Amino acid sequence: SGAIYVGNYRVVNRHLATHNDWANLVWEDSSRDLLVSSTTAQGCDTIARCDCQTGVYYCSSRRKHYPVSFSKPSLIFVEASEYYPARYQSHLMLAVGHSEPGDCGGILRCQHGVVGIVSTGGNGLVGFADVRDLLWLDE
Numbered sequence: 036s037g038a039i040y041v042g043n044y045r046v047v048n049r050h051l052a053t054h055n056d057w058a059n060l061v062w063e064d065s066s067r068d069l070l071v072s073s074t075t076a077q078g079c080d081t082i083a084r085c086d087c088q089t090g091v092y093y094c095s096s097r098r099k100h101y102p103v104s105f106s107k108p109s110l111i112f113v114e115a116s117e118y119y120p121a122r123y124q125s126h127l128m129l130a131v132g133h134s135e136p137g138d139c140g141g142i143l144r145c146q147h148g149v150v151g152i153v154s155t156g157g158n159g160l161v162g163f164a165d166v167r168d169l170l171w172l173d174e
């Protein structure tokens with residue numbers, strides 16, 4: 036679990052969104068596993084606007100942060116779940132690093148700010164849903 040709080044917005048994994056998130060919906064995209072809801076308090080985080088391919092992510096299953104090199108946002112496949120079916124998740128970045136169920140929501144950051152959140156993983160890999168193209172989170 037985990038979320039990005041920026042201004043009057045909360046960004047979470049779509050498969051983990053709450054009833055409150057859906058009742059205060061701003062935007063959602065099942066193909067990206069993202070959902071953004073509105074909040075009444077000002078958010079604690081800053082968003083990166085860059086093309087960094089190195090950064091640090093939080094891994095709940097190890098209670099530790101790890102440095103990673105990650106790929107450019109692209110399409111990757113993800114098997115079924117209580118949430119989705121075999122598809123090409125878009126805007127997804129892969130990295131060599133640990134992840135397991137329960138790790139979604141961990142933040143990935145570079146020197147410019149928040150890059151995205153853990154959304155996929157498997158066999159020594161970890162996938163992050165990018166948020167750097169969501170320019171509207173700031174204005």
Ligand SMILES: NC(=O)[C@H]1CCCN(C(=O)Cc2ccccc2C(F)(F)F)C1
Nearest residue numbers: 068113134135136137138154155156157
């Ligand atoms: N974006 C999705 O469709 C995810 C929905 C939940 C399930 N999902 C996963 O990949 C679950 C998984 C499996 C092995 C290692 C790590 C994970 C992690 F990080 F939790 F995502 C896929």
Ligand SMILES: [Zn+2]
Nearest residue numbers: 085087145147
């Ligand atoms: Zn950056």
